[PDB]
Design a protein around this ligand. Structure first.
Ligand SMILES: [Ca+2]
Ligand SMILES: [K+]
Length: 345
DNA sequence: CGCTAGTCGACAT
DNA sequence: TCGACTAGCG
């Protein structure tokens, strides 16, 4: 997710009800419900005590969608993307230390203080996601396990016309080139929709708004692939892109100080950090449900080299990708975990 | 004042 | 985690 992105675009959003998508297909960033559902049972979850509470939470939102005659597609995160293996590292350690403090430091005697820590040490495993897939499948709800980030997978589904909108809490999905995003949707269907169409109404990126620039803005402000330089946020990011004349972005990156009337040096490893991050947004591997084949979110254009795009997801045989997408294989060990058949009835 | 970058709550009762 | 909010510098 991009920090403070939603406030920034708070004007391109119309309050809606999910009802408008009756008869239509809607993709879901299931992680959001999984996390919210994991909060209610933070204790049981942290101490490794058995629980199914989070499953019933996701299904509550599923049933609401069905009751409105909406066809949901639950999408799940797949493999750890190398571009994020860096940031995930820092997050692995936070849950690591956070769990421990709460676990015994507040276990003895009083407990009120500790739970605040367990909620911050919540881990959404693949085991937890598989339970939700099982529950959804039994009710005829489609589930899809992204090769890597659900974010890319969701964006693709929306672009391909497979789904009419995406349900999530993450505004950053628009940077992946998705068309419609439903935020803050409650259990009753009340949501806050943001259409990419109303997103071009912005003039903070210059006279001509561009998806390309919006993406640069998000990266410069800082994201999961590349942290921002000290003192750079969305507003400053807009200024640079807004003021900058020259098309090559790398030329502009070293020019930011010149643009921002501010004095700062851009490290060489940062230059590459922006090149990778940008390519990750563009060409992150996703799964095409129709042709059942691994494809980059965006088709490789005039000049690229897929062989150098290892950080944006490594290719694997299409049969291996299908089995992961279906939920029939473990992400890490590729062991059998299910036998769902998509080609029946 | 704008703007970045740091705590706090989420669910459930 | 993730946004919503505040504090505190340019
Ligand atoms: Ca995500
Ligand atoms: K930042």
């Amino acid at each position: 997710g991009i920090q403070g992105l939603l406030q920034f675009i708070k004007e391109a959003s119309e309050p809606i009800h999910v009802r408008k998508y009756k008869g239509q297909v809607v993709a879901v960033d299931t992680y959001c419900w999984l996390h919210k559902g994991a909060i209610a049972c933070a204790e049981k979850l942290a101490k490794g005590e058995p629980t199914d509470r989070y499953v019933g939470f996701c299904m509550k939102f599923v049933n609401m969608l069905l009751s409105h005659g909406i066809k949901p597609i639950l999408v799940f995160d797949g493999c750890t993307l190398p571009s994020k293996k860096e940031v995930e590292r820092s997050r692995r350690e936070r849950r690591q230390a956070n769990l421990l403090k709460g676990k015994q430091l507040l276990r003895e005697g009083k407990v009120s203080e500790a739970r605040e820590c367990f909620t911050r040490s919540i881990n959404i495993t693949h085991a937890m996601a598989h339970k939700v897939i099982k529950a959804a499948r039994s009710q005829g709800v489609d589930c899809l396990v992204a090769p890597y980030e659900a974010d890319a997978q969701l964006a693709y589904l929306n672009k391909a016309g497979i789904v009419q909108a995406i349900i999530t809490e993450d505004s950053a999905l628009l940077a992946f080139g998705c068309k419609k995003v439903i935020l803050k949707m409650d259990q009753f269907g009340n949501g806050l929709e943001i259409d990419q169409a109303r997103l071009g109404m912005c003039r903070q990126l210059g006279d001509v708004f561009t998806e390309e620039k919006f993406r640069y803005m998000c990266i410069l402000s800082g994201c999961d692939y590349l942290s921002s330089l000290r003192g750079i946020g969305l507003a400053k990011a807009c200024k640079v892109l807004r003021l900058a004349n020259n098309p090559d972005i790398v030329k502009v990156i070293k020019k930011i100080g010149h643009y921002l009337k501010m004095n700062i040096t851009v490290p060489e490893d940062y230059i590459n950090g922006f090149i990778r991050a940008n390519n990750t947004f563009l060409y992150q591997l996703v799964f095409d449900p129709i042709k059942r084949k691994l494809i980059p979110l965006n088709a490789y254009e005039d000049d690229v080299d897929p062989e150098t795009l290892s950080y944006a997801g490594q290719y694997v045989d299409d049969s291996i990708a299908l089995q992961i997408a279906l939920g029939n294989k473990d992400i890490n060990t590729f062991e059998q975990i299910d036998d769902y058949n998509p080609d029946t009835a």
